[PDB]
Coordinates of C-alpha atoms in Angstrom, one line a residue:
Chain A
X1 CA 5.2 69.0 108.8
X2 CA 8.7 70.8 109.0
X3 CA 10.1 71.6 111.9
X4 CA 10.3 74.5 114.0
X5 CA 12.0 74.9 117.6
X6 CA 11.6 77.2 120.8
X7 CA 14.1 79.0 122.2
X8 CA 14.7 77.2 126.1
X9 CA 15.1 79.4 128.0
X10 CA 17.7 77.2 130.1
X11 CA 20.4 78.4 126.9
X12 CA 21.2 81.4 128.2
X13 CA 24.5 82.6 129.2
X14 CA 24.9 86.0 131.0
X15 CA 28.6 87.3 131.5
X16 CA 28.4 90.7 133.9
X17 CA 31.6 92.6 133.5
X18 CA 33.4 90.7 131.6
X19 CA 33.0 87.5 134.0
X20 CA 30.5 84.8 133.2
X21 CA 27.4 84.2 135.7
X22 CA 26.2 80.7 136.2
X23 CA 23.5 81.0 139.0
X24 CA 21.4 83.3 137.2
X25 CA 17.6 82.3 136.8
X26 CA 15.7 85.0 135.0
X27 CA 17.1 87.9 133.4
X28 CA 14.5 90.9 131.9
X29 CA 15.6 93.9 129.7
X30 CA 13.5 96.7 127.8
X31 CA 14.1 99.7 125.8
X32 CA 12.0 102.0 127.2
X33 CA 10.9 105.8 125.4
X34 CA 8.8 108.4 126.3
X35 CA 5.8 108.7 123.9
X36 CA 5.8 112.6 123.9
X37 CA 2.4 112.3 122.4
X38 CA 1.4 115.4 120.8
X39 CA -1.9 116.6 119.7
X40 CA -2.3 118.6 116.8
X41 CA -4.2 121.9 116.7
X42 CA -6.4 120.5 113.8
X43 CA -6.1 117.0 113.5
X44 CA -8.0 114.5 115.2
X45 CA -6.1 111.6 116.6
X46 CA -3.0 111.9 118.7
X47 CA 0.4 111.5 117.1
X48 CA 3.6 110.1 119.0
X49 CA 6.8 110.6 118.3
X50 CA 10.4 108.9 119.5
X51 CA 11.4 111.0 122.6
X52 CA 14.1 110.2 124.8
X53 CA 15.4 106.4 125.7
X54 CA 15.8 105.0 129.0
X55 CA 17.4 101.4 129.8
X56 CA 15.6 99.3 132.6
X57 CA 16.9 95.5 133.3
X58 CA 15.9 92.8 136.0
X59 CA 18.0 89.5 137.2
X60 CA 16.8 86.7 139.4
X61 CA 19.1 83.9 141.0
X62 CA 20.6 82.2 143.3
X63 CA 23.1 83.7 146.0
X64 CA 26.4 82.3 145.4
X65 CA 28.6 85.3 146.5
X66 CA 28.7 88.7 147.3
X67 CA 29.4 89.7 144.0
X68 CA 26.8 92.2 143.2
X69 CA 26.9 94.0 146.7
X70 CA 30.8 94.2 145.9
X71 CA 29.9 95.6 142.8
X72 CA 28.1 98.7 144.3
X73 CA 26.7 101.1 141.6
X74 CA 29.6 101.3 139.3
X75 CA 29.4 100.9 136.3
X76 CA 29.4 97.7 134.3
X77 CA 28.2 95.7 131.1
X78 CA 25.7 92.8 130.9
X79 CA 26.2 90.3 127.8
X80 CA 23.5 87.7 127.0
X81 CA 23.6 85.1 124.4
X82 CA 20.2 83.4 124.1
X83 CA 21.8 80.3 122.0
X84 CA 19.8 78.4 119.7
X85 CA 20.5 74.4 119.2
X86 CA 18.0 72.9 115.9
X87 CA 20.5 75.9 114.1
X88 CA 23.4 77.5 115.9
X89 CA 22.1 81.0 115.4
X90 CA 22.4 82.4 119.0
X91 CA 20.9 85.9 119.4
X92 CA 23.6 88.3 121.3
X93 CA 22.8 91.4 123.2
X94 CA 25.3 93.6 125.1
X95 CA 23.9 96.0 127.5
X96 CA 26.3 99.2 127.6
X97 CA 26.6 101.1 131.6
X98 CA 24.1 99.3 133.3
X99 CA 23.8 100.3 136.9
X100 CA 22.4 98.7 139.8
X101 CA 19.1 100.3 141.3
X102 CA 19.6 99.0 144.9
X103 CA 22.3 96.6 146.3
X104 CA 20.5 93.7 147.4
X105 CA 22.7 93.3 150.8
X106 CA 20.3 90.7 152.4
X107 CA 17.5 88.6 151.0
X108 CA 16.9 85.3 153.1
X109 CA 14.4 83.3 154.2
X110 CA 14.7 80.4 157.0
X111 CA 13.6 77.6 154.9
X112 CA 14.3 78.6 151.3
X113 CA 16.8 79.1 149.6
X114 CA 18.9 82.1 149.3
X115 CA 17.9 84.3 146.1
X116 CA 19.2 87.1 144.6
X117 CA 16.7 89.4 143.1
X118 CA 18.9 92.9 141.0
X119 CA 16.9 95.4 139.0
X120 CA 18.7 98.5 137.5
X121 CA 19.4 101.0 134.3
X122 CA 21.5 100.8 131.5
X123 CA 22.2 103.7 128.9
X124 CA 22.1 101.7 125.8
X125 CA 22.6 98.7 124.3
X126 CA 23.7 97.2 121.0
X127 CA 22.8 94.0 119.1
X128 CA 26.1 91.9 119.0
X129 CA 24.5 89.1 117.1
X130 CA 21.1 87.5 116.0
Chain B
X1 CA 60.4 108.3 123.9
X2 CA 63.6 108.1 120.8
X3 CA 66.5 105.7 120.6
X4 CA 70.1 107.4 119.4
X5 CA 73.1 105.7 118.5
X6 CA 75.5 108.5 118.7
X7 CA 78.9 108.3 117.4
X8 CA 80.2 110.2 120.4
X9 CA 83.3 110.6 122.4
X10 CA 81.0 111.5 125.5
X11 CA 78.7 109.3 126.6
X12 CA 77.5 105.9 128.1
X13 CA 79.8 103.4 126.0
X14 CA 77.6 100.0 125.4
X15 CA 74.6 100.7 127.7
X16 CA 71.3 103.2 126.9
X17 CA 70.7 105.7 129.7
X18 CA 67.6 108.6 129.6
X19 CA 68.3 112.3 129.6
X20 CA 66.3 114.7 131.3
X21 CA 65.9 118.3 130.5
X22 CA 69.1 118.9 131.5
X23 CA 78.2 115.9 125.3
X24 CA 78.2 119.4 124.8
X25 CA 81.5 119.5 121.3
X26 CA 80.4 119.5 117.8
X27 CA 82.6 116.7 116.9
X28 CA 80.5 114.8 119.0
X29 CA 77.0 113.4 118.1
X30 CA 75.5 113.6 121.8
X31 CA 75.8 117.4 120.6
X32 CA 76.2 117.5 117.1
X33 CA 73.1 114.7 116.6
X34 CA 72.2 115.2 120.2
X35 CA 70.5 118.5 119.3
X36 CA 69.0 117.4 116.6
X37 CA 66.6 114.8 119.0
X38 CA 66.5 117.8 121.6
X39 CA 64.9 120.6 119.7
X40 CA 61.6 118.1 119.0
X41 CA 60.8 118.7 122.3
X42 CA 60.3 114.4 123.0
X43 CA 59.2 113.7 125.9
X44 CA 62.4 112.0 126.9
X45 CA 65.2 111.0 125.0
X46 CA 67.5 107.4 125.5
X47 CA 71.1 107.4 123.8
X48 CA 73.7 105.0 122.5
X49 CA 77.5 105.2 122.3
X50 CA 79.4 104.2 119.1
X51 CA 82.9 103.8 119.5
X52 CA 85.6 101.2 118.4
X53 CA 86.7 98.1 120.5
X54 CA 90.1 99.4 121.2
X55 CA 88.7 102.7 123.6
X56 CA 88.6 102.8 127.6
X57 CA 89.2 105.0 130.3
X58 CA 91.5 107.5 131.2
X59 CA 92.6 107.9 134.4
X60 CA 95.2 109.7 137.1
X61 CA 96.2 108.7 140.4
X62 CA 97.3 110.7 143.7
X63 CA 99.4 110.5 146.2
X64 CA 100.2 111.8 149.6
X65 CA 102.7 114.3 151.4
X66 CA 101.9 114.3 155.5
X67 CA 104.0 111.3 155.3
X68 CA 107.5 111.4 154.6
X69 CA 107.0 108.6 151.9
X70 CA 104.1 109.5 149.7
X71 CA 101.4 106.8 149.2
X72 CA 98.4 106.7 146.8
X73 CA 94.9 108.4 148.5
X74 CA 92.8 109.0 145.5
X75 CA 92.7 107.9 142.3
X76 CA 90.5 110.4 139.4
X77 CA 89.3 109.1 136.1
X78 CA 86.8 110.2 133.3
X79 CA 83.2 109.9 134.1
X80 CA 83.0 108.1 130.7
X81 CA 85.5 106.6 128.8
X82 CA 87.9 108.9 126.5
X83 CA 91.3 110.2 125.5
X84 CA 90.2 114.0 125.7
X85 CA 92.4 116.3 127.2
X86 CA 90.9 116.6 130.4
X87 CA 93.2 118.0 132.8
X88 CA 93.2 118.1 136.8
X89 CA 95.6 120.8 138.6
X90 CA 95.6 120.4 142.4
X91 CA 97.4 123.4 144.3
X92 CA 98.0 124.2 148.1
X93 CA 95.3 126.6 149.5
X94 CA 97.1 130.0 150.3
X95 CA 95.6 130.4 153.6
X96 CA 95.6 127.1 155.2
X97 CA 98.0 124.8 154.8
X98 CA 95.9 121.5 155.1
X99 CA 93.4 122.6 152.8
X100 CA 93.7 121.9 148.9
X101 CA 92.3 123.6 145.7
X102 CA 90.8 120.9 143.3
X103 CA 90.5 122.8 139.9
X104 CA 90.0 120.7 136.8
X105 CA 90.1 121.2 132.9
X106 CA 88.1 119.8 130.1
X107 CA 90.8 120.6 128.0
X108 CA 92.7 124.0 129.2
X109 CA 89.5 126.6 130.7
X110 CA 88.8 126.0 134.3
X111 CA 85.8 123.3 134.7
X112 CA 85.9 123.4 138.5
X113 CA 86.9 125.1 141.4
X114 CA 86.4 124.2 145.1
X115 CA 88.9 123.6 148.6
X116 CA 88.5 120.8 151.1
X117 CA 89.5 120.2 154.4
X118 CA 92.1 117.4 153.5
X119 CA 90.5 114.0 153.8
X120 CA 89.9 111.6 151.7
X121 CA 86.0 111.2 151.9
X122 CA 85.0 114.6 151.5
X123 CA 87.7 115.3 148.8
X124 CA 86.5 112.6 146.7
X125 CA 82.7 113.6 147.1
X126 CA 83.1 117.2 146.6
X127 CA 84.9 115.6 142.8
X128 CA 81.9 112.9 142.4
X129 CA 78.7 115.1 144.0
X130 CA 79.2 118.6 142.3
X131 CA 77.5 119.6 139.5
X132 CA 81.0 121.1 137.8
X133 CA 82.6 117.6 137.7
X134 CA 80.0 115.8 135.3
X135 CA 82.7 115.0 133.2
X136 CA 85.2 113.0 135.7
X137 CA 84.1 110.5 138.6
X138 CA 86.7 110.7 141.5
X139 CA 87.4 107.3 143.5
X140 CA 89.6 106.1 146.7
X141 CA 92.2 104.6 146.5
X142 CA 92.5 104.2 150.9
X143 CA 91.4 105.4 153.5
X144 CA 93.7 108.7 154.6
X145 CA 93.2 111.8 156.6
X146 CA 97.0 113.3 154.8
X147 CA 97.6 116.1 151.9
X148 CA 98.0 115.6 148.6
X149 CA 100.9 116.2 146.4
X150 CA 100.7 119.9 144.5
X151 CA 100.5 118.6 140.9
X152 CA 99.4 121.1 138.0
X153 CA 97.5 119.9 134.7
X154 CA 97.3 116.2 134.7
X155 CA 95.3 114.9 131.9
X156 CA 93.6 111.9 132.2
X157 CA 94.9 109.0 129.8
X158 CA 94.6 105.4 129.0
X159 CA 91.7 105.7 126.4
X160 CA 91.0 106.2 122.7
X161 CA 88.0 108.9 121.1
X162 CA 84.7 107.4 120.8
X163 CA 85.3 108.1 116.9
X164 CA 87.7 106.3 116.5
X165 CA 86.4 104.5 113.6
X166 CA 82.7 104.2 112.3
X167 CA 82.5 100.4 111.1
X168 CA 79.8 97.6 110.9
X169 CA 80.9 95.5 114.0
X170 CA 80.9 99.1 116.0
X171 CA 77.6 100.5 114.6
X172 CA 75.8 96.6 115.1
X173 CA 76.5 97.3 119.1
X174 CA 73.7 100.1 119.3
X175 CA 71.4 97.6 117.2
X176 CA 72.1 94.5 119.6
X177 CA 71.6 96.5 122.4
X178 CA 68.8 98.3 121.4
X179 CA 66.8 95.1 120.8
X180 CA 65.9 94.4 124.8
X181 CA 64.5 98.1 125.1
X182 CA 61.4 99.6 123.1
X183 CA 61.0 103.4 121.4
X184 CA 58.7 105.2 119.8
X185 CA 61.2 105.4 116.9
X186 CA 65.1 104.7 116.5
X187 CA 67.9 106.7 114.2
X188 CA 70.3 106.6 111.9
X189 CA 73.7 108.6 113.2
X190 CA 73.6 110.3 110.2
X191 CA 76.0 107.5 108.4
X192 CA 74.6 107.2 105.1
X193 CA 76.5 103.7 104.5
X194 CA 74.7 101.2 102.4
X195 CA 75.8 98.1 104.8
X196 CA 75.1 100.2 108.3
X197 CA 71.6 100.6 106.7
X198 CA 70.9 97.7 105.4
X199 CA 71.9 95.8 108.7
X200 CA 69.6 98.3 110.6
X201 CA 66.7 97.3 108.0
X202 CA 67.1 93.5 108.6
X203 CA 67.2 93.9 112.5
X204 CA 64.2 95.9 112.3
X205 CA 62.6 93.4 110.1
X206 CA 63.9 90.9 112.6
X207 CA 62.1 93.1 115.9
X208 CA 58.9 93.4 113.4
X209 CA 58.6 89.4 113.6
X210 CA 59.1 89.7 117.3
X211 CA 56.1 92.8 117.4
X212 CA 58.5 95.5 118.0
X213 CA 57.5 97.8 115.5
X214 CA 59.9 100.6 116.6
X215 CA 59.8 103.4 113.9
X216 CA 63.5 103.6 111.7
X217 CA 64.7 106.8 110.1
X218 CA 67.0 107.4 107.7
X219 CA 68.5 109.0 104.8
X220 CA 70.9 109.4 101.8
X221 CA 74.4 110.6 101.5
X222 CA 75.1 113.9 100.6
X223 CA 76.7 113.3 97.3
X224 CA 73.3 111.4 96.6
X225 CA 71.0 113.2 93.7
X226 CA 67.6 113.0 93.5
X227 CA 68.8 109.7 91.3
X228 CA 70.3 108.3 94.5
X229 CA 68.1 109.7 96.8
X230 CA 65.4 107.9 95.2
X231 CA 67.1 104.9 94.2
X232 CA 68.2 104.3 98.4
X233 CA 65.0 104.9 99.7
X234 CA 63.0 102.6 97.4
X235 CA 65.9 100.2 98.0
X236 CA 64.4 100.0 101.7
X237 CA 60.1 99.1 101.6
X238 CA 59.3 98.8 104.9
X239 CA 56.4 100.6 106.6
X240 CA 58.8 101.6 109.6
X241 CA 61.4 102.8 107.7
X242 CA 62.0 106.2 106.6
X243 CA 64.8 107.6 104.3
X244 CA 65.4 111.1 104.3
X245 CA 66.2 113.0 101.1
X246 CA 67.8 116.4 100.8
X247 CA 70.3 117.5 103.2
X248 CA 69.6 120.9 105.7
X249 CA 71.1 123.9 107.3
X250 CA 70.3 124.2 111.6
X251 CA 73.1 127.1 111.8
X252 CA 76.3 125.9 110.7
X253 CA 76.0 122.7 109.7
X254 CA 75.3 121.0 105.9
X255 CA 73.5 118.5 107.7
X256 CA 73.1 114.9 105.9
X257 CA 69.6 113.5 105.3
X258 CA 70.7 111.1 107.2
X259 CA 71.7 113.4 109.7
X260 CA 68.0 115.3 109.4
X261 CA 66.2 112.0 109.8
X262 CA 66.9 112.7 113.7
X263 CA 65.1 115.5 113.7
X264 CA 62.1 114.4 111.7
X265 CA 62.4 111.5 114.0
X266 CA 61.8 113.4 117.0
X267 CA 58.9 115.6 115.3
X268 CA 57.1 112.4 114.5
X269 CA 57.5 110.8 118.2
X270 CA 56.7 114.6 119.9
X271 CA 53.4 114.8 117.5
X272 CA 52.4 111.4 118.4
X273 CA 49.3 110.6 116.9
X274 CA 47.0 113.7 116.9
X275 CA 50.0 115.5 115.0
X276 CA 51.0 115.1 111.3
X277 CA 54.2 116.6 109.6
X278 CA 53.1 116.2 106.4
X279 CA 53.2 120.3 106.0
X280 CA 54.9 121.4 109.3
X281 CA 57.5 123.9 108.8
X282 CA 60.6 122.8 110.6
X283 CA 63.4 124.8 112.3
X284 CA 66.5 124.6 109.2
X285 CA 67.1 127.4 107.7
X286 CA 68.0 125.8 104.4
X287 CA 67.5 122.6 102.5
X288 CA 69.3 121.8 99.1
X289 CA 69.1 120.7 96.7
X290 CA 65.8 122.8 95.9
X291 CA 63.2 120.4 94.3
X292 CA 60.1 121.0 91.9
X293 CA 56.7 119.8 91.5
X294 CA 58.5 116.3 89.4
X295 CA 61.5 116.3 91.8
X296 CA 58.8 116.4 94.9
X297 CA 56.6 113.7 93.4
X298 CA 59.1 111.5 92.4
X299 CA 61.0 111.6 95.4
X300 CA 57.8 111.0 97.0
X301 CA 57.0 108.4 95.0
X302 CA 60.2 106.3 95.8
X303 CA 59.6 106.5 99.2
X304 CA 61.7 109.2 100.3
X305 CA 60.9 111.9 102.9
X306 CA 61.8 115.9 101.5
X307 CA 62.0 118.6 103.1
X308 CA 61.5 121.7 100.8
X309 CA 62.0 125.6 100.9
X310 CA 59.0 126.1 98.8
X311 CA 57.6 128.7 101.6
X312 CA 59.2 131.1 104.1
X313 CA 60.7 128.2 106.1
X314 CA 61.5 124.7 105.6
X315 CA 58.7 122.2 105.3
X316 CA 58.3 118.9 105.0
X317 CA 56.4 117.9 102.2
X318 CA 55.0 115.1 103.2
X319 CA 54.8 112.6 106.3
X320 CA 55.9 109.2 103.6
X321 CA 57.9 106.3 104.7
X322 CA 59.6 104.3 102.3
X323 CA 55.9 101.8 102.0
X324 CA 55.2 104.7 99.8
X325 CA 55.9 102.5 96.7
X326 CA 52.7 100.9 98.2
X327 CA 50.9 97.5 97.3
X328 CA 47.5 97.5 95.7
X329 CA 45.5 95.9 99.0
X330 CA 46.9 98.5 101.0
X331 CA 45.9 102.1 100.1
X332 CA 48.2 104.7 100.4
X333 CA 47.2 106.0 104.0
X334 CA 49.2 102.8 104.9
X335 CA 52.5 104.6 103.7
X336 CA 52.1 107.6 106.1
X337 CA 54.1 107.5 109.6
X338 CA 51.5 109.1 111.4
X339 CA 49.4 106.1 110.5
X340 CA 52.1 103.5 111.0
X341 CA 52.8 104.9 114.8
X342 CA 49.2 104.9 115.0
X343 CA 48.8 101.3 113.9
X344 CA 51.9 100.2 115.8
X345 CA 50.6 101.7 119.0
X346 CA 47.4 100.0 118.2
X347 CA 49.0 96.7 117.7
X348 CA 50.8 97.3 121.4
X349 CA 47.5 98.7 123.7
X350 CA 46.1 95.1 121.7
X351 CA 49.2 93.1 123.1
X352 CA 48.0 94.2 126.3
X353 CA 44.8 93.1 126.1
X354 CA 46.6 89.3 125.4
X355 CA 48.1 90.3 128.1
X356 CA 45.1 90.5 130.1
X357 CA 43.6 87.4 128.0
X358 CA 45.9 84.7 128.5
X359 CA 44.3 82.0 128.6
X360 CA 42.1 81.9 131.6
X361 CA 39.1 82.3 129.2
X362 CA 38.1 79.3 127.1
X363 CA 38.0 79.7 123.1
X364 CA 34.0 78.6 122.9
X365 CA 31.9 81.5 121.9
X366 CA 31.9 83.4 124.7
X367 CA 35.6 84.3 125.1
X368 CA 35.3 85.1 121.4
X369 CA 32.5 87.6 122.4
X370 CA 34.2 88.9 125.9
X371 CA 37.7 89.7 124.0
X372 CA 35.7 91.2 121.0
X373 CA 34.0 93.7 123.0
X374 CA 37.0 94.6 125.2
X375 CA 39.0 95.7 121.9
X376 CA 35.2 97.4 121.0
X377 CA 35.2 98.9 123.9
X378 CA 39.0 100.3 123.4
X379 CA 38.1 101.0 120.1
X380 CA 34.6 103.0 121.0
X381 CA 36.8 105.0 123.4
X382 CA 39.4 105.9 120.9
X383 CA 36.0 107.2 118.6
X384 CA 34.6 109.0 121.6
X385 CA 38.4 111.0 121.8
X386 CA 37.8 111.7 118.3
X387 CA 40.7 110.0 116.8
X388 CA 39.1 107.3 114.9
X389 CA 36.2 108.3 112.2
X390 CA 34.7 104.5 111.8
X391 CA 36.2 101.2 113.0
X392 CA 35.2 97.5 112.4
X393 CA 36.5 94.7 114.7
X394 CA 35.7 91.2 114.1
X395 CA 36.8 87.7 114.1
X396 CA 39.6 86.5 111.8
X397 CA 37.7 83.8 110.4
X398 CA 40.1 82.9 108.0
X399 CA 42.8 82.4 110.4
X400 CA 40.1 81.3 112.8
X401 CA 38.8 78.6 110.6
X402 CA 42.3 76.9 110.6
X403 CA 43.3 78.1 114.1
X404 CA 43.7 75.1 116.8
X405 CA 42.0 75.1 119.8
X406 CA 44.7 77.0 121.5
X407 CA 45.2 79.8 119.3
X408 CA 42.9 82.6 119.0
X409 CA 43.0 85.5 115.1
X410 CA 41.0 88.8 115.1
X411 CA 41.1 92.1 112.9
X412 CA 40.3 95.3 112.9
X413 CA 40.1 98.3 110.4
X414 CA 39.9 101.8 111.2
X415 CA 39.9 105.0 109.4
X416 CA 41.3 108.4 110.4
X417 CA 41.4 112.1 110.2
X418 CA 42.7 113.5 106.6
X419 CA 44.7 116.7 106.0
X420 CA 45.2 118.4 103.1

């Protein structure tokens, strides 16, 4: 019964502009594209077609500074290497000019602790490694 | 920016200073070779004196006459050193007594007129401040408020010329001194001596292993053929040196490829990297000897630079360094100046970026993939600007399989615009 594995999703490493990230919980990112379905004057089932591209990406974690309210809506990069440990072959993605959607200035509860929730855009990406 | 070790007798001697927009003798090479940098229109331009050990200052002292017993008030020597006939005639103004005319030569026409009061301070800062007395400093000797002594003509003396002789210990000054600063490209004087250019090739070598690729030009001798001209410049195989072949006319002047190499110096560092001279006409009115088709491509071949009258004007018929007699791993876009600026200006923007990785990022996999896709990310920016077609920047494996922990080998390879 050979073996397989599952990526663990603890192996992640996510360095935001250049600087590595260590509180980080959950990060999300999609490719989006509008269908731009088009139906044909004579054919009977809708065809779709590429359209234009649009980033979207998501982080959860814990507040350790005020890093990302610092980092305003410039511009930065996103790196995430999703390691793999039965073989080495860690799957890099680089996100090019993400941009934050909202600065998360204050997020606190009285008994909890103090997450940091950022969700945002970024122009493209482009497969570093798999 | 251009380096110039001019064999001058005006000039800096044994320290490099900038010029601005703003020697001026034909003799000398801050004029002679001086031009030859200024008519590439480089940005700026940073000269070197040549001259022989045995060559100082010349100088001239004053004295007073308020005083029944003269005493020294001001002392006048040459802004830089030399034993030109530059004269200083000091005369009694005809209206007031107290006030005296300053008038100085730079070898009999009159350099400089002006009148002062009679003290010391201002008398020495009207000869220091004005524009007309760039060619002498003026200094105190006390503190006076008396009249000078009427003197006509005094040449200042106490020096030797700045070519006084042109030998190895001399020329190796320029080289020694040239190795704290960094240029765009250095020169040749126009000195087509075997030894001077030989020792320039090994310090360059030298300031290669140290990652100062600075750019050399040079060239042949005029009694060099095509023979010799050939035979000197495959002699040198270095990708930042250039040798020169046929000699040139500006206006007067049988200039030596040697002597040319200036100006093709200063075309390269003015185009930077967007330009190429591999067809630009240039501003002599006459090259000899004429070459052919064979002449051209053998020259060519051996690694020399010609220029050409094979149109209207002189052009250069191609932008070759002396790598031209290339290797097989390297293809022949290696041997082109353009490129090698390019590449060395590369290897300095990537110096930076050690610069700004030094050490604070660990050597796991992740520093490996932050400083990767910093030089991308310079790289992708240089694409955008248009001056890279396709690049590919990875890991040095090879290096990086037998690097230590502390040491860190990467690569790129890029290719670029063609002209025909």
């Amino acid at each position: 019964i050979e073996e397989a594995s599952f990526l663990n999703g603890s192996d992640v490493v996510i360095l935001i502009d250049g600087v590595e990230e260590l509180y980080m919980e959950e990060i999300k990112a999609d490719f989006e594209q509008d269908e731009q379905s088009i139906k044909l004057l004579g054919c009977q089932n809708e065809i779709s077609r590429v359209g234009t591209t649009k980033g979207s990406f998501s982080l959860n974690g814990y507040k350790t500074d005020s890093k990302f309210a610092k980092l305003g809506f410039r511009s930065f990069e996103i790196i995430y290497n999703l390691s793999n440990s039965e073989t080495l072959g860690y799957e890099s993605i680089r996100l090019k000019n993400c941009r934050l959607k909202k600065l998360p200035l204050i997020n606190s509860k009285a008994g909890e602790i103090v997450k940091i929730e950022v969700e945002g855009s970024f122009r493209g990406y482009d497969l570093l490694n798999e | 920016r251009l380096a110039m070790p001019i064999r001058a007798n005006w000039g800096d001697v044994g320290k490099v200073v900038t010029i601005k927009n703003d020697g001026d003798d034909m003799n000398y090479s801050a004029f002679k070779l001086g031009k030859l940098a200024l008519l590439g229109n480089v940005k700026e331009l940073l000269l070197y004196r040549l001259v022989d050990g045995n060559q100082k200052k010349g100088t001239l002292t004053l004295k007073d006459t308020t005083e029944n017993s003269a005493k020294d008030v001001i002392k006048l020597e040459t802004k830089y050193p030399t034993a030109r006939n530059f004269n200083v005639t000091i005369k009694s103004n005809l209206v007031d007594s107290d006030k005296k005319d300053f008038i100085f030569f730079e070898n009999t026409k009159q350099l400089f007129s002006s009148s002062i009061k009679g003290t010391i301070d201002e008398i020495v800062l009207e000869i220091n401040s004005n524009l007309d007395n760039e060619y002498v400093i003026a200094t105190k000797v006390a503190d006076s408020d008396t009249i000078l002594a009427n003197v006509v003509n005094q040449a200042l003396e106490g020096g030797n010329d700045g070519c006084t002789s042109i030998t190895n210990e001399s020329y190796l000054k320029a080289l020694e001194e040239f190795e704290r600063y960094s240029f765009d490209s250095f020169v040749l004087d126009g000195v087509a001596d075997e030894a001077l250019q030989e020792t320039t090739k090994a310090w360059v070598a030298k300031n290669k292993e140290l990652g100062k690729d600075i750019l050399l030009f040079l060239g042949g001798k005029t009694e060099d053929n095509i023979k010799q001209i050939n035979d000197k410049s495959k002699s040198f195989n270095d990708e930042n040196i250039v040798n020169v072949g046929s000699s040139a006319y500006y206006e007067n002047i049988k200039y030596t490829p040697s002597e040319v190499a200036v100006y093709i110096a200063a075309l390269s560092v003015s185009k930077g990297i967007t330009g190429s001279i591999c067809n630009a006409k240039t501003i002599f009115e006459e090259v000899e000897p004429r070459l052919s088709q064979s002449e051209v491509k053998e020259c060519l071949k051996s690694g020399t630079l010609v220029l050409d009258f094979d149109d209207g004007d002189v052009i250069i018929v191609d932008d070759v360094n002396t790598f031209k007699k290339y290797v097989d791993d390297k293809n022949e876009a290696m041997g082109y100046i353009s490129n090698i600026m390019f590449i060395n200006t590369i290897n300095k923007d990537t110096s930076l970026k050690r610069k700004e990785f030094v050490g604070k990022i660990f050597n796991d996999a992740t520093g490996q993939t932050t400083v990767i896709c910093a030089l991308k990310k310079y790289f992708e920016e240089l694409m955008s600007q248009g001056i890279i077609s396709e690049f590919n920047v990875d890991i040095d494996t090879e290096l990086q399989a037998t690097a230590k922990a502390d040491e860190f080998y990467w690569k790129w390879d890029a290719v670029k615009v063609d002209v025909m």
